[PDB]
Design a protein around this nucleic acid. Structure first.
Ligand SMILES: [Zn+2]
Ligand SMILES: [Zn+2]
Lengths: 180, 160, 126, 86, 87, 138
RNA sequence: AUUUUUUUUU
RNA sequence: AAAAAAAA
């Protein structure tokens, strides 16, 4: 799984990134909850060559197998949100599979100033898939979920989480105003 | 070997280009077709699909697919989809199903106002959505004659 | 234009003959159909004024029926009167709703109006 | 597409359908019998040719495109009474 | 079985019962307490109504070609009223 | 009413009449070579084949399964089950036994009609039957 | 490190 | 040259 340093660096939601100029890469943290009683299933994927994180996630969920008549709640925290090709592949996959309630949570928007990306996000919202910006609750959830806290770390996560939540207001407003 | 069979109506380049231009104009420049969708040729993994226009009707949708590399080549296909259930749809029924939700039609109290000579505000400029109905509509259309950029019609694109 | 003035009174004898199972010629039926359409079309205050007129007419007929059956307070007399009156309601619920088809188009309802009037006058009372 | 026809006997304006090349007797066997008239003492007419008596489906074989349900072609029987106008 | 609709001018149009059952007004008018008389519809409009009855009962089943009904506009308005009485 | 719908609606009457079907393709190539390409395309299902119905723009297109995602069809065995206009049908014909031309028509798919889901079918039925005209409140 | 413009401060 | 904010 992830790392505390990896979490704080790769899940940034700011528009500054300070003087150091490490690159931010799209990541997917998916979690499964079935209503039968099985434990939530946790996973994370990167933008492997060609296989964007979303597409990899789709292939993973298709390959690992699940019952068709049991409704499953899937939530994916995407670092960069889905692109237009991913916005269409995910829409098609979620229309094909009826029993999957998909919740996409984006820490920041991917080329939100371009028209096709806005249309893809509107498509995702319209086709039963609610895509919303990360706020403090999901930031904290994916913090204590997808990170091992055994190792020592600097920068108290309390501050980390509050910093991320504070950064995640302008982009929340941008997403709320981007749907039309 | 496994196959999937589906009906493609062969069209030439000019008509497909005109349909794409009209749907793009009314999606963005105009306001009638804002609720539709569009899947460009680079957003799909199908080697032959050049475009896909999605028209959401209620909880279902209508998908119009335009193809790349057929013979005697390209073509247009129409499908009606509702939660993994899909049917082939002819151009006339496609237009009729489109007109049910999107483009303005005569109001409920439109026959009466015309009967007394009163003005009727909401008309029906999408004639292609009406293919036999009732004599009231025929008389009304013969009474009032009902757009500079033509509206997107599936039957005109899928002509010949 | 011409709605409910010199028009509803024209069909009032026809309405009360249609009620109570009184013989009415077909030509009168066609005339009443035309008059109902003209009333519901020319000024459109049909599903309200025709509604009130039909409601008061059916209520008056129900009251007259109660007056004519209270003279038959005997249990056997009450039962036979109820039987013949149920035949009357069957015939009226069959025939009366048809002329007021345009009531549904604008907004039958006369059948359920008669149903609730009979429920209040008879079913609720007895 | 079978031919569609209307017969104008003065006021009466019967409407019916017939085959593309059906004989006149098939036109006036039972179809005219609705008027309670047997084939005897009855003869069809058509414009000015008068159709003679019957059995000749050649001249009576009106083309389908010439007589549509939207605009059926008159026949006549015996004068006709023209329709009124607003 | 053929019904005989009489217009306001006395012009009797005889039509098939299933063709004249298209309009709900006729279907409700006939059954109850044959032949149907009218007080307002003239001959030149009842004729068009019967023509439309035939045209619709013929072309409703068709799904490929639907030829247009030729309606003269100068009378269409009046025709509309008659249609509003029937359909 | 799916079973009855085939016998009267004109679309199926014109579609199911043993229509002549001609393969469209590499007609520019020599006829012997062209029928060789058709044979080797039918041999391994890794291409598309279109039949033009000989007179209309309507064409039946056979694409390989693995072209629109993974999610019976033969190839005298030209069985093509689909759901046309809301009713399950099978386009059946023969073109592969001959060189490059043949016959093709429609037959009812009773098995697919029974196996098809009900809610969406009646939803489409209500969508098709109803008319937009004079429906908006005013 | 997804880009452009605008505003304030040093 | 650097920091913070808003919009596309
Ligand atoms: Zn992507
Ligand atoms: Zn319309």
């Amino acid at each position: 799984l992830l790392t505390a340093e990896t979490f704080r660096l790769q899940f940034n939601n700011k528009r500054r990134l300070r003087r150091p100029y490490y690159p931010r890469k799209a990541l997917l943290c998916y979690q499964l909850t079935p209503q039968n009683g099985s434990t939530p299933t946790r996973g994370y994927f990167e933008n492997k060559k060609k296989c964007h994180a979303e597409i990899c996630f789709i292939n993973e969920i298709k390959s690992m197998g699940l019952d068709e008549t049991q409704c499953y709640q899937v939530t994916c925290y995407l670092t960069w949100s889905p692109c237009s090709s991913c916005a269409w592949e995910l829409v098609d996959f979620i229309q094909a599979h009826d029993h999957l309630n998909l919740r996409i949570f984006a820490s920041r928007l991917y080329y939100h100033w371009c028209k096709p990306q806005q249309d893809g996000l509107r498509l995702l919202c319209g086709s039963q898939v609610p895509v919303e910006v990360m706020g403090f609750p999901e930031f904290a959830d994916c913090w204590e979920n997808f990170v091992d806290h055994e190792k020592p770390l600097s920068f108290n996560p309390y501050k980390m989480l509050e910093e991320l939540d504070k950064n995640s207001r302008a982009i929340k407003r941008r997403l709320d105003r981007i749907k039309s | 070997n496994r196959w999937q069979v589906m009906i493609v109506w062969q069209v030439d380049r000019m008509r497909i280009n005109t349909w794409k231009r009209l749907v793009k104009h009314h999606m963005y420049i105009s306001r009638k077709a804002k609720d539709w969708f569009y899947r460009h040729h680079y957003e799909s993994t199908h080697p032959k699909i050049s475009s896909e226009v999605h028209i959401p009707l209620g909880d279902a949708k209508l998908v119009i697919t335009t193809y790349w590399g057929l013979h005697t080549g390209q073509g247009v296909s129409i499908e009606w989809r509702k939660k993994r259930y899909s049917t082939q749809v002819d151009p006339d029924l496609a237009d009729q199903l489109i007109h049910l939700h999107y483009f303005d039609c005569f109001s409920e109290s439109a026959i009466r106002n015309t009967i007394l000579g009163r003005i009727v505000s909401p008309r029906c400029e999408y004639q292609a959505g009406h293919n036999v109905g009732s004599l009231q509509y025929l008389a009304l259309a013969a009474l009032i004659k009902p757009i500079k950029p033509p509206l997107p019609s599936v039957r005109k694109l899928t002509e010949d | 234009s011409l709605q409910f003035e010199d028009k509803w009174d024209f069909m009032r004898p026809i309405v009360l003959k249609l009620l109570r199972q009184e013989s009415v010629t077909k030509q009168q039926w066609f005339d009443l159909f035309s008059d109902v359409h003209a009333v519901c079309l020319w000024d459109d205050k049909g599903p309200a004024k025709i509604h009130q007129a039909l409601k008061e007419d059916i209520l008056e007929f129900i009251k007259q029926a109660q007056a004519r059956v209270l003279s038959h307070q005997d249990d056997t007399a009450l039962l036979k009167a109820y039987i013949v009156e149920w035949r009357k309601f069957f015939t009226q619920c069959d025939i009366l709703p048809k002329p007021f088809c345009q009531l549904e188009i604008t907004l039958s309802i006369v059948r359920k109006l008669m149903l609730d009037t009979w429920n209040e006058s008879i079913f609720s009372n007895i | 597409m079978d031919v569609f026809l209307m017969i104008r006997r003065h006021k009466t304006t019967i409407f019916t359908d017939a085959k593309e090349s059906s004989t006149v007797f098939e036109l006036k066997r039972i179809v005219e019998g609705i008027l309670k008239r047997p084939p005897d003492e009855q003869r069809l007419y058509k414009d000015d040719q008068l159709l003679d008596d019957g059995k000749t489906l050649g001249e009576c074989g009106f083309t389908s495109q010439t007589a549509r349900p939207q605009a059926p072609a008159t026949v006549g029987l015996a004068c006709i009474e023209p329709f009124s106008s607003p | 079985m053929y019904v005989k609709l009489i217009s306001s001018d006395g012009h009797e149009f005889i039509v098939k019962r299933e063709h004249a059952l298209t309009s709900g007004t006729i279907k409700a008018m006939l059954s109850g307490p044959n032949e149907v008389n009218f007080r307002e519809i003239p001959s030149h409009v009842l004729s068009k109504v019967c023509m439309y009855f035939t045209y619709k009962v013929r072309y409703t089943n068709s799904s490929t070609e639907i030829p247009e009904f030729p309606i003269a506009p100068e009378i269409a308005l009046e025709l509309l009223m008659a249609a509003n009485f029937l359909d | 009413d799916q079973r009855s719908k085939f016998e009267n609606e004109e679309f199926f009457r014109k579609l199911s009449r043993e229509c002549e079907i001609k393969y469209t393709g590499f007609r520019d190539r020599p006829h012997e070579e062209r029928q060789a390409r058709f044979q080797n395309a039918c041999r391994d299902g890794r291409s598309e084949i279109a039949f033009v119905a000989t007179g209309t723009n309507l064409s039946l297109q056979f694409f390989p399964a693995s072209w629109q995602g993974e999610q019976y069809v033969d190839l005298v065995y030209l069985k093509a089950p689909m759901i046309l206009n809301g009713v399950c049908v099978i386009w059946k014909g023969w073109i592969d036994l001959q060189r490059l031309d043949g016959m093709g028509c429609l037959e009812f798919d009773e098995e697919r009609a029974q196996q098809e889901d009900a809610l969406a079918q009646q939803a489409f039925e209500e969508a098709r039957r109803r008319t937009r005209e004079f429906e908006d409140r005013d």
